[model samples]
Target: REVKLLLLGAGESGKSTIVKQMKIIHEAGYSEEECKQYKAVVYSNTIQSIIAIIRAMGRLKIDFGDAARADDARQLFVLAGAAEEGFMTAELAGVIKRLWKDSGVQACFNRSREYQLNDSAAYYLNDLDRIAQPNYIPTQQDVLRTRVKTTGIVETHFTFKDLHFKMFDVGGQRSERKKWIHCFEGVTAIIFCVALSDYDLVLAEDEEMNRMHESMKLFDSICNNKWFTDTSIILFLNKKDLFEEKIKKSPLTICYPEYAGSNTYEEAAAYIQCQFEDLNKRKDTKEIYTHFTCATDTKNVQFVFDAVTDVIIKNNL
Candidate 1:
């Protein structure tokens, strides 16, 4: 059977990473130029993340004590602002590192939930010196974790169990979601990816709304849509590792006031899973399968894919 699967969820839900992993598992490794391209994205995100955290701190009235350091930081911010390319220059990275290590900046990064910073922002920030080198190339893990907002649709084809599978990955931003209706006609199943780590953060596009809240609302719409009424729904609560780490420092209740469970990983994750599971209006007619995943882990994805193939095959038959 030929399967047309649609990958859905809000932006940064690790939808694209699933596609990337498919290539890694089935196809050859990425070329040097491809790795270099991802390096550029990493550099761009590093600068942007630092700039965002600093601005957020200013908005929250966090104090940068030394006037000299403040001016230097502000000047470096403008340099990052004006340049659109060549972000991996050693000089610019040095400036970012200097500002990022500031007492006030560190404090603001700790309060990252107050800003639109990506979850991996701190990961790149801590590794500034190493990544700034001109010869530096990104590892597979670095490319997987890097955040480059998907603007248009991307797709890939692979075969499993003699079934031809064509998966479509659409841009999950609000503006890009309108294009999704066009891809619904032939879809046999929907893989809805939700980042379990976003419970404490707000959407980068819209600061007024919480990230998880937006995911819930989007999932509800997809689950209830008539086009997918007969289509299988597979929910992947991705970024489990980051979710576990985040819950240790930030409680889930910060975003979910109704969450009465403790901050432990099990209760918190179960509570989140329930939010999506409860949205299945066709409980008697169709089942919504849920999985906890970390998309960056190739081994985990391979395992999940095997199970997913079984589900798809059984439903299609």
Candidate 2:
């Protein structure tokens, strides 16, 4: 039951957002990652960064079977790995443009959230997208759950039936991308976050649309060319709350294909599912589950997580 999950993206595509949702699914009381809002956490190299933060704030820590970490105890609750690799590819650098211009290109950009300097560990991803590297923001405390909370954070765990997993989260910055490839070793699955809105916006923007196409092309290229063909891929189309609002409020909104002229969410989901299958080609080895999620709202968050659980359970994890 070892799940060595790798969350890969180019900044603010909701990689951290998925981590927060997993926290809620596991019965941990969710706290916003905004440092000013919640306690702080102490980050460690081997330990998952967010978990380390939770331990520092006394919110939660690693515990063993039948025994939990005491107050001010050692913050080793789960035997997992969380590391950050700096950004790698430049904005639209990795993508192969001509083939995938109008396909799902704009959708990828429109769906993502850009990296901003709210969180130090996370802004690395955002920095990759933009030209400038965001200035460092010092945490009030070395510990993660101190008086302040961090926002736009992602959290997840690796449960090994025999051997616990060492998970790594690649910073979403464009420059930090190269670091992600290193962690692919011993990696069991990749949990990729695609901001649902980015998909919309890329479609709308005239020139920026190419970047959108490149983003997904880069993803598919990384997966198909470099990694094992049979590797399990769980793709999340996130930001449900925002997506719903866009559809309802903007009649001029041409985000979704079905709704673009005559498409519904369900149809759009089907479109994405089909496209992934077509693009990936290894449909037998790869499974694409498209979900519409707004991570903060908690509504239908289960829609996404439950599907992931099925994958874990089917594997007997």
Candidate 3:
């Protein structure tokens, strides 16, 4: 049987990143032009993130280390906000780096609860001078780190071993959930991705609610739906690396008040996994396979996909 996999999850849960990994593994990697395009996106992300930080500082009335430079940085927000082609130059990059090093700017970054900056914000900011070059090309890691929000459904087809695979990626935002009904009927499996690091974060669309809580509600709905009773649910607890790092500074109990375990990755991941498993409505009749994953890591994604392929092929028989 041909494998039809539908990837579902909340936004920033690593669904699109998984699709990129599929392209890297099954299809050939991105072309030179594609890498260049990613470079542009990364540059834009760096500039926008800084602008957001400065704007937030102003709104919060926070002071920076170098007040003069911070004011100057605020003035350049318009230019960076435009995101023009020529504006992504070495000169602008230098100014961004200088502003980023200010103590007040750093304070603003920590307090900017409303903005959801890209994970690679600091990486790109630190390397501004090099990446700002007109002829710069992104490396594989650089391309993987770039952020592009998915707005609609994206589908891809490929063959691995003796099985033909068709994978569908849907936008994870609440508005996009309506379109998902169209792809539900014939799916062979559901790769439900959730970010473990999102425990403390709120949804980008709805800031009033916690992200992890929303994900659990979504998981409950999907697991209980009759249409997918026969389909396998592969739970991808993604962004383990970020989760591990975050837990060192932020306690899980802050988001999940009932969490009893100590603040360590192993304990936290196990507890989070249990939350999903315990919510599986079909636990008596169906199995929900789970894995800890880092979607941007090529080797990690490749290994997980290989294991997923085995499970899919076995069930087909």
lDDT of 3 by residue, 94-171 (tens): 678789888888888775445676777777777777777777788777788878888787998887877888999998
Give the clash count for model 1: 0
- Per-residue alpha-carbon lDDT of candidate 1 for residues 46-163, written as tens digits (9 for 90 to 100): 8778878878977998876555568767677667743247456666777787787788888887887776787778888898877877688888878887887887878788776788
Local error of candidate 2 at residue 17 (angstroms) = 1.2
Separately for all candidates shown, the number of backbone clashes (residues 3 or more apart, or on different chains) is: 0, 66, 1
- Per-residue alpha-carbon lDDT of model 2 for 1-317, expressed as tens digits? 46677776545566655555454545443433543232113222212322333333332222322222232123223222221232212222112121112223223323233211122333222222331123322232222211122233233564423434444565655556666666667656776666554554432223345333445765687567545554566676665545455544333234333434433455455555455446676666666555566655444665666676677557634
Q: In model 1, where do residues sit more than 4 Å from their true spots?
A: 65-68, 71-75, 78-83
**Candidate 3, residue 214: how far the Cα is off, in Å:** 0.3
- Candidate 3 Cα deviation (angstroms), residue 239: 0.9
Candidate 2: RMSD to truth: 18.2
- Whole-model lDDT for model 1 versus the true structure? 0.84
Q: CA lDDT of each candidate?
A: 0.84, 0.44, 0.83
In terms of lDDT, the poorest run of 10 residues in model 2 is 91-100
